[PDB]
Design a protein around this ligand. Sequence first.
Ligand SMILES: CCCCCCCCCCCCCCCCCC(=O)OC[C@H](COP(=O)(O)OCCN)OC(=O)CCCCCCCCCCCCCCCCC
Ligand SMILES: CCCCCCCCCCCCO[C@@H]1O[C@H](CO)[C@@H](O[C@H]2O[C@H](CO)[C@@H](O)[C@H](O)[C@H]2O)[C@H](O)[C@H]1O
Ligand code: SF4
Ligand code: SF4
Ligand code: SF4
Lengths: 70, 176, 99, 154, 309, 45, 144
Amino acid sequence: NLTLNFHGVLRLVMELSGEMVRKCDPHIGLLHRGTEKLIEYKTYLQALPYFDRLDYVSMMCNEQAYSLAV
Amino acid sequence: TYKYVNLREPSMDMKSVTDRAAQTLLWTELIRGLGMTLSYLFREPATINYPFEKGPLSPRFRGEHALRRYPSGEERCIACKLCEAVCPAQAITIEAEPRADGSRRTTRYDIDMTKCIYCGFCQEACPVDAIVEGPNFEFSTETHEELLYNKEKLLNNGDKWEAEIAANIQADYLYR
Amino acid sequence: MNLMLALLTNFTLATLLVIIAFWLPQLNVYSARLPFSMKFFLVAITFLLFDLEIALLLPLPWASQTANLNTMLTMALFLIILLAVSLAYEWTQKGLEWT
Amino acid sequence: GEYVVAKLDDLINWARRSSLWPMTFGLACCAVEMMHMAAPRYDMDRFGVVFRASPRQSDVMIVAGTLTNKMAPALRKVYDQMPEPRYVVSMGSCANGGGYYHYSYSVVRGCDRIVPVDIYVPGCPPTAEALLYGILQLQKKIKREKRLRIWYRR
Amino acid sequence: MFMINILMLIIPILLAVAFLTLVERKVLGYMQLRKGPNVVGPYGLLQPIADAIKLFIKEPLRPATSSASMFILAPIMALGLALTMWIPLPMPYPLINMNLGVLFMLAMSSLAVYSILWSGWASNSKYALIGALRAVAQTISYEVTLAIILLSVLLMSGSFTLSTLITTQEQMWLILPAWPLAMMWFISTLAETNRAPFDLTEGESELAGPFALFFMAEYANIIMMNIFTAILFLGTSHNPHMPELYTINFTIKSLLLTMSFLWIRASYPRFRYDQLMHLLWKNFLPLTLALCMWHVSLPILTSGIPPQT
Amino acid sequence: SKVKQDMPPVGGYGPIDYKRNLPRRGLSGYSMFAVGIGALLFGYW
Amino acid sequence: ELLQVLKRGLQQVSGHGGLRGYLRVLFRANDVRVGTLVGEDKYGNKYYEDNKQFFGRHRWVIYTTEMNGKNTFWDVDGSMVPPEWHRWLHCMTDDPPTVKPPTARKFIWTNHKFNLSGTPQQYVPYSTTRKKIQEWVPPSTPYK
Ligand SMILES: CCCCCCCCCCCCCCCCCC(=O)OC[C@H](COP(=O)(O)OCCN)OC(=O)CCCCCCCCCCCCCCCCC
Ligand SMILES: CCCCCCCCCCCCO[C@@H]1O[C@H](CO)[C@@H](O[C@H]2O[C@H](CO)[C@@H](O)[C@H](O)[C@H]2O)[C@H](O)[C@H]1O
Ligand code: SF4
Ligand code: SF4
Ligand code: SF4
């Protein structure tokens, strides 16, 4: 079992036997920026721009989801 | 309503089987792919000749900030602090006092351009069109400190860019 | 002679480029078993055995000048066919799978 | 002795700024605008900027996105492995000074706490054209270097 | 006079490689709806010079190498071997006229895998050695088909002399009687030089001066494979009183084949490692063995055995 | 003055294609093999 | 049409006023297209358009060789475009400042400045407010 230590940035800890993948362990949090906590210090309008920056490929869809909830 | 993207049975008659055999051995789909990249070779490229040519922008473009004046030269900003209150990044810092002529005016107006998210909420909140995001976007710096704007910097941007800023506001204010 | 000079020049130039590539101003004043599959050993060994028989096929362009073409053609095909049997054996014994 | 040194600076400065190979830390949103600067409209390759290079062959690091505390040691490790000369371009508000997450418990307030930065590109995100202006500005900065002139006055 | 001649081969090869890097970036650019280098010199003509100067004054970062001797040997071996592959090429006259020139080229290219092996041993890293062992396993596998395909073609030529391939193709290109072999030959060169869609050293690793020398060797080999493909399958007619007419036609074919490497790189995704091994061991090799059998029999049954000399 | 707003043209926009269009080209497998064998035979002769 | 293509290429040399002018724009702007001279600003930048070109390449500027005392023969910069032409060059409008001049104000900069970062003219931040706490100043005459 050979262990290998390696959109954004991802850390994959993998175990291989020859060519095969026995286990994939994604280690995330490399882009955790406490957005959910920051939103608690914003008004509802002030929080809206945070949703552009989640799935920052689908900005207005994220805006739409937040708007519908509000 | 739905459709199947990949639910088909290949025809198993000899002509169809030989067609697939010919594709496998003679690489026909791969040759077809080469035709597509060849066709692009002879297409005019989409590249523009920056900085001699520029990407199109609209009057609404949110760029570098600036503080504006009335035609007389009086500042438009009256230190209401609505911009500072709405700023999602807390990138605006304001102090004010009665000016020597009794006017309501700021003594500090800082924008930390490295906190700012260029959202334009400040120019929406301003009741007198004092703070705007201008059309400039070519103001990168060699140091961090150069991006911590004070009132002097922002007033100069207003005096520097007013000719364009006034024209852009003219083009879009009926949408606001 | 000409061949030895050509060889000397090629590797001498490669040596000079390499040592020059390593030395330039700068201006600065301040024995085990690899965790690697048995499958890759078999690829190397299979290459070796197939390579040895290609060594025996290399003389075929000259052998076709023979007056004994019955024998030459039979032996040439016999060899290539045995080469194919070797591949079919590797193949059917799962010597070519990577899983 | 002094004419030669000035011309030799010009040559090596020209070669380095004409052949700027970037390693992109595509950390977040700003990486999308970096991809657009590689895309046909701007085509960074036409300036001699290769689309992607490994760190060991890289001349410039573009920090394109938020740098979290969890990610900071890795970013420093990559920077230390760059061969010199090496330059850092900080792209966008997050990398510039923390931006919209500046007050977060998990965010580095500016990538210049971790590595020395040569150019700061403002915006959230900067437009692909704004990044290209920043890259060209770095080229102008390299053009002003006088390494051999200072070497021979030592 | 001969040392002049050697230099008239070596220096142009390195120049051709330098400007192949420009041509690759521009061809790929235009197939991608962009332009590629066009600022550094007119139409990017100074881009190779800027890149070369930049690479050679870059900091030469040597990590702790396990074997200093093998750290220097591998690039010297790679560059020296690459240059050596050109000395028997008839353009239309070779620098050295070898009776067994085809075998010499076969013998020399089979040593090119040592520089991969020695660089993994010199990398002082387990993962770099493993990557080097995968590259070797790929290279030697496709050596198998190249050698057998080459032998099959020479059964129509009758000789190991490279200039005999010119005589053999006086009336007609060998691509016509041997296009199935040409197809697999061409794909084999791509996998042999570790080119896309067989660029698995770059793909797998993704998941200064010395670097430049390895790169020049690799690109010198890419041009040479395509020169060899042009001689083997698209033979240019040679007129002894106007040898430069051969060289121009010869050069154009070689350039077009070299650009087809570029064209192919722009068009396909990459193979999986096991998938390119299956392509060789389960597809090309069975068909090359059958076509080797066929090409031994065909001259005998048509009464078309070529002359020994 | 009358309200003026971004609106579609009277009658709407013209039709817009969206279905996959991958046109069929080339010969049948029989013909392709026939040409290849024919080329080989000419080369052999 | 291969001949007509070459004629147009030759016309570009004439369009740029000879071989020297042709080679100057080639080495300064890497582009030898001939366009209609829309206008020239007070700094010497010249502005061209060609509406046969696709959107994005239909407008361009040839930067002056000297601006505010700086040699810009080789060192051109996007910030060198003054605001009144900036709107037209980026297609925020269809009217160049020659046809629709900007409104004049007494406080608007008469002289545009380009990006001054990294020069002695660079911006340096500071607090614009006055001291808030005033210290007691002891008397200058002894009387302990
Ligand atoms: C009269 C009697 C005569 C007797 C002799 C008769 C013989 C003639 C009839 C036989 C013709 C044989 C064809 C030889 C070509 C090799 C065919 C082949 O191996 O292709 C199959 C291979 C795998 O195919 P796949 O679909 O993935 O799976 C099948 C395996 N299970 O698929 C592939 O190899 C894919 C190719 C990979 C490379 C892709 C990148 C380049 C592709 C475009 C190249 C363009 C062509 C190059 C030409 C070069 C010219 C020098
Ligand atoms: C191929 C033809 C080339 C002809 C041109 C010949 C010009 C010779 C002058 C070369 C000048 C090199 O310039 C110098 O290069 C080295 C890289 O090795 C850089 O790096 C060097 O300096 C830094 C500190 O400054 C050190 O930490 C580093 O370890 C060192 O390698 C320098 O930052 C750069 O100043
Ligand atoms: S653009 Fe948004 S983040 Fe920037 S100063 Fe204005 S309100 Fe604050
Ligand atoms: S800029 Fe506008 S919103 Fe902000 S304090 Fe001044 S007047 Fe109020
Ligand atoms: S600066 Fe703005 S666009 Fe860039 S990563 Fe941060 S939030 Fe996203």
